[PDB]
Scaffold this motif. Structure first.
Motif, short mmCIF file in Angstrom:
data_model
loop_
_atom_site.label_atom_id
_atom_site.label_comp_id
_atom_site.label_asym_id
_atom_site.label_seq_id
_atom_site.Cartn_x
_atom_site.Cartn_y
_atom_site.Cartn_z
N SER A 74 36.93 52.62 34.09
CA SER A 74 35.78 53.39 34.55
C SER A 74 36.21 54.63 35.32
O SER A 74 36.24 54.64 36.55
CB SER A 74 34.88 52.52 35.42
OG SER A 74 35.47 52.28 36.69
N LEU A 75 36.55 55.69 34.59
CA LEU A 75 36.98 56.94 35.20
C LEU A 75 35.78 57.77 35.64
O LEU A 75 35.89 58.63 36.52
CB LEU A 75 37.84 57.74 34.22
CG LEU A 75 38.73 56.91 33.30
CD1 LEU A 75 38.08 56.74 31.94
CD2 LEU A 75 40.10 57.54 33.18
N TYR A 76 34.63 57.51 35.03
CA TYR A 76 33.41 58.24 35.36
C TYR A 76 32.60 57.50 36.42
O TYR A 76 31.73 58.09 37.07
CB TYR A 76 32.55 58.43 34.10
CG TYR A 76 33.31 59.07 32.95
CD1 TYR A 76 33.46 60.45 32.88
CD2 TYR A 76 33.86 58.30 31.94
CE1 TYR A 76 34.15 61.04 31.84
CE2 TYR A 76 34.54 58.88 30.89
CZ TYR A 76 34.68 60.25 30.84
OH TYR A 76 35.37 60.83 29.80
N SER A 77 32.88 56.21 36.59
CA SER A 77 32.18 55.40 37.58
C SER A 77 32.29 56.01 38.98
O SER A 77 31.46 55.75 39.85
CB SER A 77 32.73 53.97 37.59
OG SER A 77 32.01 53.14 36.70
N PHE A 114 27.52 59.67 44.45
CA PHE A 114 26.10 59.97 44.61
C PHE A 114 25.43 58.97 45.55
O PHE A 114 24.39 59.25 46.13
CB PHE A 114 25.40 59.96 43.25
CG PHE A 114 25.72 61.16 42.41
CD1 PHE A 114 25.51 62.44 42.89
CD2 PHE A 114 26.23 61.01 41.13
CE1 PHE A 114 25.80 63.55 42.11
CE2 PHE A 114 26.52 62.11 40.35
CZ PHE A 114 26.31 63.38 40.84
N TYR A 115 26.05 57.80 45.69
CA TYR A 115 25.51 56.75 46.55
C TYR A 115 25.81 57.04 48.02
O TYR A 115 25.20 56.46 48.91
CB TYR A 115 26.10 55.39 46.16
CG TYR A 115 25.44 54.77 44.95
CD1 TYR A 115 24.32 53.96 45.09
CD2 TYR A 115 25.93 55.00 43.67
CE1 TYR A 115 23.71 53.39 43.98
CE2 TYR A 115 25.33 54.44 42.56
CZ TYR A 115 24.22 53.63 42.72
OH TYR A 115 23.62 53.07 41.62
N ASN A 116 26.76 57.94 48.26
CA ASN A 116 27.14 58.31 49.62
C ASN A 116 27.71 57.11 50.37
O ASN A 116 27.42 56.90 51.55
CB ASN A 116 25.93 58.88 50.38
CG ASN A 116 25.80 60.38 50.21
OD1 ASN A 116 25.13 60.85 49.28
ND2 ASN A 116 26.43 61.13 51.10
#
Length: 43
Positions: A9-12, A18-20
């Motif tokens: 998961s390189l994009y995870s 975005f979750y901060n």
């Protein structure tokens, strides 16, 4: 494939950002270093 060369998961990471969420315990020693300075000009 999808399991050889740190391809988990390189994009995870783009989501998590975005979750901060990341620094829950420390992560970046800044808050503590700020307290030490408080006494730097108070001997």
């Amino acid at each position: 494939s999808k399991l050889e060369g740190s391809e988990d998961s390189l994009y995870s990471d783009y989501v998590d950002v975005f979750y901060n969420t990341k620094p829950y315990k420390h992560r970046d020693d800044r808050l503590l270093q700020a307290l030490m300075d408080i006494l730097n000009e108070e001997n």
